[PDB]
Amino acid sequence: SDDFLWFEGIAFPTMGFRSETLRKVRDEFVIRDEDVIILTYPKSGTNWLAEILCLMHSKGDAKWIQSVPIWERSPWVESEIGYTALSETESPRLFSSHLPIQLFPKSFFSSKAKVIYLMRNPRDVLVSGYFFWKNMKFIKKPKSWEEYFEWFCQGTVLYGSWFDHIHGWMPMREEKNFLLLSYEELKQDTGRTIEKICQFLGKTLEPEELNLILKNSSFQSMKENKMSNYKAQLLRKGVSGDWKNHFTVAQAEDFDKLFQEKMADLPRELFPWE
Amino acid sequence: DDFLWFEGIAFPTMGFRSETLRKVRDEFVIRDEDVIILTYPKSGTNWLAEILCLMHSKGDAKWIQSVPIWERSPWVESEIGYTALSETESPRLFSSHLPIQLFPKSFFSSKAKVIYLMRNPRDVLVSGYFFWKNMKFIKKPKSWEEYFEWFCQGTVLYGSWFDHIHGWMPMREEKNFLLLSYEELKQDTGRTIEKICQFLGKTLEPEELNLILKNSSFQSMKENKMSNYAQLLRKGVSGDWKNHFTVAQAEDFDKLFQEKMADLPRELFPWE
Ligand SMILES: Nc1ncnc2c1ncn2[C@@H]1O[C@H](COP(=O)(O)OS(=O)(=O)O)[C@@H](OP(=O)(O)O)[C@H]1O
Ligand SMILES: Nc1ncnc2c1ncn2[C@@H]1O[C@H](COP(=O)(O)OS(=O)(=O)O)[C@@H](OP(=O)(O)O)[C@H]1O
Ligand SMILES: [K+]
């Protein structure tokens, strides 16, 4: 399909990305031991976690996050813009990727860089991407909700199948330098999740800094910040369980059975959702 | 709104008059030889009408193919059907969507036969939404989710499905009342036609039964302009609600149904 850039069997937008750069990310891009990296399948909460990590760095202070765009603060490494920015950024770098593991820099796997993998209920991911992308250029636009649902289930969407992305990355979950989080836990107890992030990154927070990190990374505050919430909004609703307002009963039924079949080989305990 | 309201019930603004609806209820004379189809709208009225027309003609299709269905089985409460039925020789065949409290009072001391056809209200909902979607002389919903809310509230043509059923179900043990479902008509068409024959005192040969099943199938009725008035014949299955109810709508509707219908035997409803 020539509405996507196809690279190693995975779909990317037709503007912003270059197959030469994607090859270099895999083969050449040097990961430093001080790097902190956010990994997500698209629409799983990348920007929320980028905001939290920025607010950790600035101790809850908001001037920086309110005056520099979030995509400059946490560049998207496989994108042309992210790639070149990062090779000129001083440690410690913060950045993110949506790459499935077979495309991720080789350099990472023998380094000590810390990655946080954020997963989200793929039914909520499907809804989120549907609304964000549905009128965007340089992707294949679906004729309908039903068609986009079909693509998503078949993995013919940006960054390929959700099921493969997750299978690719789950074998890393017991590594010391890999934190596995979900959007559901992050939404349900933000404080306790930010504390998991602290232990992992070895940071300590004062009580007042914590209050401020919680305040400024909540949905309501981020939504107002135009540097972070980049005519369909990145911050659309910010809940778990919205898939219910959008899946038909038949789509729900089809998806439950595709999920149980694809994920049968992984501990059910990994996925905190119904 | 854009409805004619009568006794708290919405009707279209074209083709209907308050004064007629008064006479239908208070004055219209039901005859012992009338055969009457009662449905809440979008429950399969035209399917049943075509079947009974076909029984009348022993399966021959020429009549049903040359006279509009709504002329062979008039809608009694419309202007046109009211007037036409006053000039129709017995035995009359006709349809009504009226809830019990608007139905001709002379019916209840008559020996007319009614066939009440019920359908899963979720399927009724879908069916009306698509049919009445773009159409003047009634109020159009701005969205699927709004139409859904209307239907749940009863703010739709002919009022609440839950009340219609509640009003008419206490008649069901009467000798002259046949209760059917769209579901059994779809799943078990021969058996259902046999029950209608039994109820109306008709008998039917196998060649006749086959003609009836051929000439009243969805496909065959779809291609026949006298039966297909957006289209009357849209998809013609059961369970299409699953392709339109979101999961949350399904949860709301289940709760609503169970609450509204708890006073009737669950056995009445061959779905869910
Ligand atoms: N602060 C906060 N709280 C709760 N939820 C939030 C927050 N920030 C972003 N989000 C939600 O995450 C969804 C966007 O995901 P991504 O940032 O991964 O999108 S992207 O792939 O990076 O373009 C998108 O989800 P939906 O609301 O379900 O569409 C965002 O609203
Ligand atoms: N022959 C046949 N086989 C199967 N299904 C059929 C048939 N004829 C009508 N129908 C379906 O009944 C729906 C229309 O209902 P009504 O005739 O009650 O409409 S109306 O109230 O009289 O305007 C409408 O249902 P949906 O397809 O679900 O919209 C019709 O398609
Ligand atoms: K770990």
Ligand SMILES: [K+]
């Ligand atoms: K009876």
